[PDB]
Amino acid sequence: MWQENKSWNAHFTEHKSQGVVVLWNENKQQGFTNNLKRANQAFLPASTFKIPNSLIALDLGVVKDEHQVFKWDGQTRDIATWNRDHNLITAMKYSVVPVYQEFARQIGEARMSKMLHAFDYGNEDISGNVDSFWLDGGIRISATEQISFLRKLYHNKLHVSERSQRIVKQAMLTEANGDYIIRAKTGYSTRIEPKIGWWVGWVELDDNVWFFAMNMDMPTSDGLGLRQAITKEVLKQEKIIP
Amino acid sequence: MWQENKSWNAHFTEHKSQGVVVLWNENKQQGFTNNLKRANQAFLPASTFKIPNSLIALDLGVVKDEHQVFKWDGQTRDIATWNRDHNLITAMKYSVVPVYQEFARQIGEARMSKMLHAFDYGNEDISGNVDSFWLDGGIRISATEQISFLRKLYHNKLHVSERSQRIVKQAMLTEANGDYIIRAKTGYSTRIEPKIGWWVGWVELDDNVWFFAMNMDMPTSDGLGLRQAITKEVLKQEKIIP
Numbered sequence: 001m002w003q004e005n006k007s008w009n010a011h012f013t014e015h016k017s018q019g020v021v022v023l024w025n026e027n028k029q030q031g032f033t034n035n036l037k038r039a040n041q042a043f044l045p046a047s048t049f050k051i052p053n054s055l056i057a058l059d060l061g062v063v064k065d066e067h068q069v070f071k072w073d074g075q076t077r078d079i080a081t082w083n084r085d086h087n088l089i090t091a092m093k094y095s096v097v098p099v100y101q102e103f104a105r106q107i108g109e110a111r112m113s114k115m116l117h118a119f120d121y122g123n124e125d126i127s128g129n130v131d132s133f134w135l136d137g138g139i140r141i142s143a144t145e146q147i148s149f150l151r152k153l154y155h156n157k158l159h160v161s162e163r164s165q166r167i168v169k170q171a172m173l174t175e176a177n178g179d180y181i182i183r184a185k186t187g188y189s190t191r192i193e194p195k196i197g198w199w200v201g202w203v204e205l206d207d208n209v210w211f212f213a214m215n216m217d218m219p220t221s222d223g224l225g226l227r228q229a230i231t232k233e234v235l236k237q238e239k240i241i242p
Numbered sequence: 243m244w245q246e247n248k249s250w251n252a253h254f255t256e257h258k259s260q261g262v263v264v265l266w267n268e269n270k271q272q273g274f275t276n277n278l279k280r281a282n283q284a285f286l287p288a289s290t291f292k293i294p295n296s297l298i299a300l301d302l303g304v305v306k307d308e309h310q311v312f313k314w315d316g317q318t319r320d321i322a323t324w325n326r327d328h329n330l331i332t333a334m335k336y337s338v339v340p341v342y343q344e345f346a347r348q349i350g351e352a353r354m355s356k357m358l359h360a361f362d363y364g365n366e367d368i369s370g371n372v373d374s375f376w377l378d379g380g381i382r383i384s385a386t387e388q389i390s391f392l393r394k395l396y397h398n399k400l401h402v403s404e405r406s407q408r409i410v411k412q413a414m415l416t417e418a419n420g421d422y423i424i425r426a427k428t429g430y431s432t433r434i435e436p437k438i439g440w441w442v443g444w445v446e447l448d449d450n451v452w453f454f455a456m457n458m459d460m461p462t463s464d465g466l467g468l469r470q471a472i473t474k475e476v477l478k479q480e481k482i483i484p
């Protein structure tokens with residue numbers, strides 16, 4: 001099932017960094033990582049929780065569809081892209097926490113807990129504020145647990161409507177060309193030490209899917225682009241993307 | 243509602259070419275084109291017909307979902323990418339005509355006509371061979387009629403399940419980055435002598451979507467890249483993409 005490829009650690013060291021990348025070959029049903037311990041270490045999901053959060057909001061009509069416009073609340077926050085109107089597509093792309101905080105408050109702590117248990121999502125614990133638990137409450141999920149959750153989403157096997165799963169998979173769209181499609185979601189955990197940067201999703205090829213879950217130590221916000229860069233270098237080495 | 247802009251013809255003449263580009267601003271309900279007459283002249287859809295053909299095949303259950311595998315028949319054809327197994331995603335991406343000819347035979351004359359009428363697609367005429375009418379039969383569609391059709395698809399308004407429409411829009415994914423998403427379909431009309439290349443679809447942006455339909459005279463296969471290139475030079479002049 002799982003296989004440790006120590007050679008990917010060079011992509012972390014050359015960038016003054018430390019972390020884990022986890023890949024899963026869907027056709028062959030084989031997994032790969034540079035660090036199996038860290039691959040199974042559970043962290044706060046941070047904004048990667050926007051994937052299950054959207055699925056719950058959509059199956060509950062808190063979000064009607066991907067074009068509904070939730071406008072700014074007039075409060076200027078420290079990330080410029082947040083201070084405007086958004087839909088599901090753009091709130092996911094720019095990781096607009098206030099929008100999903102409003103979703104969370106509308107979902108409710110009860111329905112949130114039941115749905116995460118149904119998703120088998122991490123430790124299934126929402127202790128804390130209903131609108132911040134994924135950022136500074138009790139929820140914990142590991143890299144291999146992200147892949148397990150993403151594989152069910154890819155196959156429409158989560159305990160929500162197929163429509164909700166298709167919409168969220170649409171909103172996860174990050175990059176596409178004639179070689180590959182990436183559906184993914186970034187995340188940055190800052191409230192609990194050590195600070196952690198996430199990238200989780202998958203790569204669609206013509207005749208295979210490669211799921212990935214990555215996290216790395218991220219002391220400041222200036223190295224956040226290293227999440228995609230390191231992940232891509234592993235993908236280039238494994239001949240997954242050209 | 244419609245405005246002419248002959249500045250765009252410079253992009254055509256720059257490449258010793260001729261054709262039409264039609265843009266539709268969804269927010270403004272406003273349209274633009276370099277040649278109004280040509281914008282409303284009907285042509286064979288060629289492989290742009292794979293958009294409606296896919297919708298009908300999915301709705302009628304000829305295609306179960308975007309993962310079902312259509313086996314190569316073993317007949318070696320001139321386009322190398324056709325000589326392999328395909329699913330709906332890859333059959334669209336590589337314009338695999340033989341796969342869609344099998345769809346059309348399964349759908350059949352009676353159901354194909356009824357669905358095209360319900361779609362109000364072009365002249366709604368499928369006279370000719372059931373498995374080749376979009377390539378050398380009687381169906382005809384204009385650039386502006388393509389947009390009218392695409393707008394209905396985008397809003398899930400066609401007489402097919404929302405699921406059918408969602409799957410075809412996923413299969414139309416062509417290009418995506420941080421700036422825009424392009425969902426489109428190429429086409430190459432070669433059997434009636436006004437031999438033309440098509441590119442129809444739309445560009446998704448954060449706060450808007452720009453529908454487009456273009457066709458140009460295309461004497462050989464070597465100029466096919468000019469469909470996307472000229473279209474993009476127009477989108478970059480209107481500052482629709484960076």
Ligand SMILES: CCOc1ccccc1N1CCN(c2ncnc(N3CCC(C(=O)O)CC3)n2)CC1
Nearest residue numbers: 047095097098132135136186187188190191221224
């Ligand atoms: C409004 C409620 O706020 C909180 C409530 C409760 C706890 C924490 C927050 N804050 C803390 C600050 N934060 C933050 N910091 C740095 N970069 C980013 N970014 C967004 C996520 C991006 C990503 O996904 O990579 C990276 C940049 N976010 C957002 C969450």
Ligand SMILES: CCOc1ccccc1N1CCN(c2ncnc(N3CCC(C(=O)O)CC3)n2)CC1
Nearest residue numbers: 289337339340374377378428429430432433463466
């Ligand atoms: C199998 C049945 O065929 C026929 C039956 C009946 C009439 C015509 C065809 N033929 C003609 C040859 N053809 C063709 N030629 C050149 N390039 C391409 N291409 C595919 C479309 C691509 C595009 O979508 O842009 C461009 C390349 N296709 C496919 C359709």
Ligand SMILES: [Cl-]
Nearest residue numbers: 207327328329
């Ligand atoms: Cl396949």
Ligand SMILES: [Cl-]
Nearest residue numbers: 170173412415
């Ligand atoms: Cl998509």
